[PDB]
Ligand binder design. Sequence first.
Ligand SMILES: Nc1ncnc2c1ncn2[C@@H]1O[C@H](COP(=O)(O)OP(=O)(O)OP(=O)(O)O)[C@@H](O)[C@H]1O
Ligand SMILES: O=C(O)[C@@H]1CCC(=O)N(CCc2ccc(Cl)cc2)[C@H]1c1ccccc1Cl
Ligand code: NA
Ligand code: NA
Ligand code: NA
Length: 287
Amino acid sequence: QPRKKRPEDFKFGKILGEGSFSTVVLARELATSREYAIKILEKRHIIKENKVPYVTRERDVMSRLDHPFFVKLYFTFQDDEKLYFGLSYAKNGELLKYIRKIGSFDETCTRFYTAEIVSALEYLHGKGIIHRDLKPENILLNEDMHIQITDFGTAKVLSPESKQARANSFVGTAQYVSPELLTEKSACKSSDLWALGCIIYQLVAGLPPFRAGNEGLIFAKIIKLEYDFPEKFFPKARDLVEKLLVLDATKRLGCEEMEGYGPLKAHPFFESVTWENLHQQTPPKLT
Ligand SMILES: Nc1ncnc2c1ncn2[C@@H]1O[C@H](COP(=O)(O)OP(=O)(O)OP(=O)(O)O)[C@@H](O)[C@H]1O
Ligand SMILES: O=C(O)[C@@H]1CCC(=O)N(CCc2ccc(Cl)cc2)[C@H]1c1ccccc1Cl
Ligand code: NA
Ligand code: NA
Ligand code: NA
């Protein structure tokens, strides 16, 4: 392995963002001149806030990933005060920023970005991992405008030894949380497909489908499947969303009980998509 890195091996630049318990800084490694986004956590805070399992989970999960549509974890290190994660830098930031600025994506852009998310989930689920907090804030964009999914401290590696399907930790974001987590108190891979349906809806409509000024109101709508489509919504995309936003998690297109990603990739909304080539394709410009 390469020499373990230390803070003094880098020059830090701007803060890229600040979370409730972490700060991400842009950094240049002196010996190479490479750029990294380094996520830095104060140990005393992680302890106070009961976040040790989160930090451990983030490292363990990201260490297993090796796919172009995910933020890469290159290294970790620590000192007396802090934990450090050396991540790929996604220069163009959050997908959410683009939704806010443009309001709606056109059909070509919706299809392209949805296809990348589907490709990423196929990989993640193939490794028996549930994301559990999939949302536009956690889909970053690299310099070439391909996706880089992030935020794995609330992900779950399902145990292959027990053929585990359900995860019991209560994690997520209200607009994207699945009805099974609310009613049955567990999530499954298909919970991410529910989140996918909410995201596709959001790209086209400009708002996620279950929305309210507080969480409990959103929960009430999710479990009733209470949402509507705006009058103009690409029809094949509406069909796809209606096949993802299904209360019964065993009936969502793409889930294991529905025979997996093949039928999802075969949906008519994706007819023009070349799946094998996506990360090397030039993304359509977002206008
Ligand atoms: N790999 C990266 N490249 C570029 N920006 C990043 C990267 N990882 C995280 N960020 C940005 O850094 C900011 C802080 O991220 P961080 O994980 O610390 O908190 P968060 O996910 O925004 O909030 P919370 O963790 O409280 O839910 C976020 O806005 C994120 O968009
Ligand atoms: O578990 C691991 O893979 C490593 C191994 C080295 C190590 O001791 N740690 C961190 C242990 C830890 C976690 C949280 C706090 Cl608040 C303090 C110590 C883990 C760690 C080191 C650096 C950066 C992140 C992490 Cl999770
Ligand atoms: Na996040
Ligand atoms: Na985060
Ligand atoms: Na959340």
